[PDB]
UniProtKB/Swiss-Prot annotation, chains A, B:
Changing residue 180 to A: Moderate decrease in cleavage of target RNA in the whole Cmr complex. It is an enzyme of class 3 (hydrolase). Its EC number is 3.1.-.-. InterPro entries: CRISPR-assoc_RAMP_Cmr4, RAMP_III_fam. It comes from Pyrococcus furiosus (strain ATCC 43587 / DSM 3638 / JCM 8422 / Vc1). The keyword Ion transport does not apply. It is found in: Cytoplasm. The gene is cmr4. One of its GO terms (biological process) is defense response to virus. This is CRISPR system Cmr endoribonuclease Cmr4. Forms oligomers in isolation. Part of the type III-B Cmr ribonucleoprotein (RNP) complex, an elongated RNP with Cmr2 and Cmr3 as the base, with Cmr4 and Cmr5 forming a helical core along the mature crRNA (39 or 45 nt in length), while the complex is capped by Cmr6 and Cmr1. The 5' end of the crRNA is bound to Cmr2 and Cmr3, while Cmr6 and a Cmr1 subunit (Cmr1-1 or Cmr1-2) cap the 3' end of the crRNA.
Amino acid sequence: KAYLVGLYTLTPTHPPIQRERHTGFPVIWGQSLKGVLRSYLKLVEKVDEEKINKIFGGLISVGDAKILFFPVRSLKGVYAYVTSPLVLNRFKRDLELAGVTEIPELTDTAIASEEITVDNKVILEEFAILIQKDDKGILESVVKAIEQAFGNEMAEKIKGRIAIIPDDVFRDLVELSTEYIPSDTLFYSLILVTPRAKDNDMALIKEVLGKINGKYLQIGGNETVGKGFVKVTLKEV
Amino acid sequence: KAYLVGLYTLTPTHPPIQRERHTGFPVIWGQSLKGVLRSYLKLVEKVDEEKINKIFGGLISVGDAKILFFPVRSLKGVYAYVTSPLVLNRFKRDLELAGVTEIPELTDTAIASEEITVDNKVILEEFAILIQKDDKGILESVVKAIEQAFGNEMAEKIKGRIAIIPDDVFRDLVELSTEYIPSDTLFYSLILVTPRAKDNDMALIKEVLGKINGKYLQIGGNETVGKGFVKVTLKEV
């Protein structure tokens, strides 16, 4: 049994940023995320401190939050949600691990919505990447996956502003575009239920974790100056 | 008769990590691996505690999991799966032992895919290794070997990001690149069937081990925060 956590930053978020060593991608460590989830249920949702211990300590596993979509300045559409084959493939494989489409390799080309495309080009910051026709409906397939994983609300935000760009460009942008993770960044994370869990426990998990969906949490430093506020989604599989 | 176990880390894994005395290479001791294989069959795959005992205790031998590919930050391609003549040679020798290509000695040069090569160089972390032309079809032969040993899915992931580098550099990287084994690390291990085995025993081994192929297991510490989740492959020879 698995739960899908979405983390959409509403303000610049600072989890020296926490980055994955061999990629350089920003990441929210599972240790940190588990902490804020624990604190939110104890303080805001008023869950009994007996139910919390029974679930966190454990009974579930809170994985590190990877990055799915990163907001980047765009010439047409003001900004686009950019991602990459590598990132998307990791997302598909993490869905497999949780129980739950072919995405090609891009080198110097991109696949983007027609709302951010101008003269067969998408202009991200200063990068001017050539688009290639979206055959076999890649974009429409990513949007559907976003809907399933995070809900209809998240899919509407992103739809119309998607751009799948080369892995190397995504890396460059994600490292050289602000310190703070920008607002309008979408993270995702797996919550896995341990095999040692009994049938009586699954009802507890579903009840307590269910409270998290659609709420607002604070992650990382600088809470007092409006940093690290995120909207969380949570769905079963 | 022998089985080839593949271990692909999906999250940072902690088996002070278990390292081989005379190389310094990370390794998963057979005792540990045997434990998690056993527990997985007992908890998840629901194998009767009589079939498990007849096989584990024994009837098979679970060897130490050596390291085959190690993910390293790359300038081009974001990251590469690096290996070395030494590592590859051990892999070939382990296949010999399991019943089943010339790889040169590299000094200050490397053999890499053209997707991570930039201006006749592969840039791993800070190391800038001069590449040499891929003659005698070395890379495609490793990919072919990867396909046979771990499956087509594993070969696609690695293809395009391979880099065979000098033994001393591989060693340095494997020691000085994170505590935790990174995600996207590929281990391998032999499962050898004792000579004392009859035909009825081969059917039990084939059946139970077959359950392991393509599944997800947890190895080492920090299960509660999404660490040590690995994807296992299992193939006969």
